[PDB]
UniProtKB/Swiss-Prot annotation, chains A, B:
Reported modifications of this chain: Alternate disulfide bonds occur in equal amounts in all variants examined.
Oligomeric form and interacting partners: Under physiological conditions beta-lactoglobulin exists as an equilibrium mixture of monomeric and dimeric forms. Interaction with LMBR1L which mediates the endocytosis of LGB has been observed in PubMed:17991420, but not in PubMed:23964685.
GN (gene name): LGB
Residue pairs linked by disulfide bridges in the UniProt entry: 66-156, 106-115, 106-117
Database matches in InterPro entries: Blactoglobulin, Calycin, Lipocalin, Lipocalin_CS, Lipocln_cytosolic_FA-bd_dom
Entry protein name: Beta-lactoglobulin
Domain of life: Eukaryota
Gene Ontology cellular component annotations, sorted alphabetically: extracellular region
Species: Bos taurus (Bovine)
Tissue localization of expression: Synthesized in mammary gland and secreted in milk.
Main subcellular location of this protein, as a coarse class: secreted
Localisation: Secreted
Amino acid sequence: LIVTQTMKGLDIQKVAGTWYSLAMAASDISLLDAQSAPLRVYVEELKPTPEGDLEILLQKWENDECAQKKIIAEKTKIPAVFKIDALNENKVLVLDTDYKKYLLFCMENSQSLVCQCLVRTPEVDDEALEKFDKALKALPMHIRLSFNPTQLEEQCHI
Amino acid sequence: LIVTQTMKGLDIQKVAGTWYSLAMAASDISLLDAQSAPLRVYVEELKPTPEGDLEILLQKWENDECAQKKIIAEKTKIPAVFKIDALNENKVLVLDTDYKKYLLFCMENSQSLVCQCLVRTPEVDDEALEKFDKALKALPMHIRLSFNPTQLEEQCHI
Ligand SMILES: CCCCCCCCCCCCOS(=O)(=O)O
Ligand SMILES: CCCCCCCCCCCCOS(=O)(=O)O
């Protein structure tokens, strides 16, 4: 567990709805470098199921097309930590959110890592980006990407 | 002139020798995203000519090969600003250096921008990266890349 920042008292129900991946960062350049990189994902919506699991609707550029993807992150005993179903055990951690404006999360396996600043609106939230940068300084990131309001309103941020 | 930070009293002679492109950033994701992106360049050496011009030896990934490139940046009336010979008028600005450890520079045309933290050794200089990040906050960057000591000792940082 490289990431040692989580949101205390996370109410997973209140993060439902629309988000924009305003920024992203990864421990490894190649995790995010090209449009088809395996962890370049854009979140459209989070749907917490009644059980306390979390469905994630996102867009990912695959075979020269912006593809929809639905994935479920299964709840654990820690309210801010969730398991995604890949080959290898993948954890999603919610580092921080104010529910109504911004949410910071990371995903790690077990050695490498990707994190995002999620925002509710197609706007550059300087304050949320500050928080994101501060959460990141204590992590070994090597690629950071940011998106403007025009790209935010486009499929796969083109 | 988006960039309004320059090094006062720059002695261009004393920046000669070996440098490592430890970090890079650009106003536009696509300027740096893939290995063949037009401004993903790695500096090996700076040779200031007796006239006060600056020759730059660098590596750039082109047609599936790490290619050498020699370019000359022509001196202007400002000692920290140089003109490179492209189609459109290109300026190199030296923002800051202590000559012996680190050098921060940017290149801009005339709307978009790329900057680097150059270091003398194949080491992660936290202090120089602080300076680089601080010089950048006052700029509209959207992609940031960092390299580790292993990648630094490789052609084109592979
Ligand atoms: C606050 C919760 C936010 C969590 C969203 C992170 C999910 C991204 C993981 C993609 C899985 C791998 O990509 S996939 O294309 O194969 O599905
Ligand atoms: C402190 C001085 C450092 C300046 C180095 C910046 C030069 C990079 C510009 C590449 C030109 C375009 O790329 S090229 O491949 O066509 O040559």
